[PDB]
Amino acid sequence: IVGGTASVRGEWPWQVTLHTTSPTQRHLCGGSIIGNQWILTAAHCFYGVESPKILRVYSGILNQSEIKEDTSFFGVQEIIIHDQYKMAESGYDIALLKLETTVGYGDSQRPICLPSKGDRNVIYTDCWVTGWGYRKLRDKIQNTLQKAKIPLVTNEECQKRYRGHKITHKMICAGYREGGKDACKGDSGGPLSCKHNEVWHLVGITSWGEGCAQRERPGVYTNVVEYVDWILEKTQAV
């Protein structure tokens, strides 16, 4: 996160840090608890991931330093990538992780509500991007979970800012016209959480941008409302 501040423990209890074990253990992506055995993240996170066996999900983490060899985690049973996904910049940048065990909900870890189909019309004015990613293009993974309030941008305005790209309605953008606040390397897969009627909703999944927090370059997110049926299809399979 660029231009963010430290989060407080328990502020984003749906936020997870997805680690990879190969070749050495490191943070890979962010993610969101959406069900007691489901994590919603970005499809691009699994580039070169040959097996779910190398993956470890940690919930209820404020600081990366809380993760040691004795720290408990959730193993991943299955990686479900949207089958239309080719690349982040083309969309369908969405994946589900089915956990090997159930997440016990509590004050440190709980799910975030998916947006409602009627909420496709609502105007979100309180949106936050969270993660342990870089503070600038050439940087490093941050110890403390960072947060940044960023305004949503219309598809029309986002398309003007991304000449040569096709910004679809399955993407949602966020950022200040002058830049300064955004997601960056290592924040992808994480949430764009928006508060509406005292309830937080998973509005986006951090996907891509041209550089980090640049002027007239909004961050591009998977528009979660457009994938609710896909999520239910995969998580409510008979």
Ligand SMILES: COC(=O)Nc1ccc2c(c1)NC(=O)CCc1nc(ccc1F)C[C@H](NC(=O)/C=C/c1cc(Cl)ccc1-n1cnnn1)c1nc-2c[nH]1
């Ligand atoms: C010690 O541990 C570490 O250093 N861990 C570590 C360190 C960096 C990264 C990963 C892990 N994570 C990954 O590499 C995930 C996998 C992957 N991701 C991308 C491209 C290829 C690819 F393989 C892409 C992924 N991208 C992002 O995360 C976020 C992109 C982004 C999003 C918005 Cl909304 C706006 C601007 C953005 N940016 C534009 N430019 N930069 N950002 C990424 N992730 C790492 C490097 N690139």
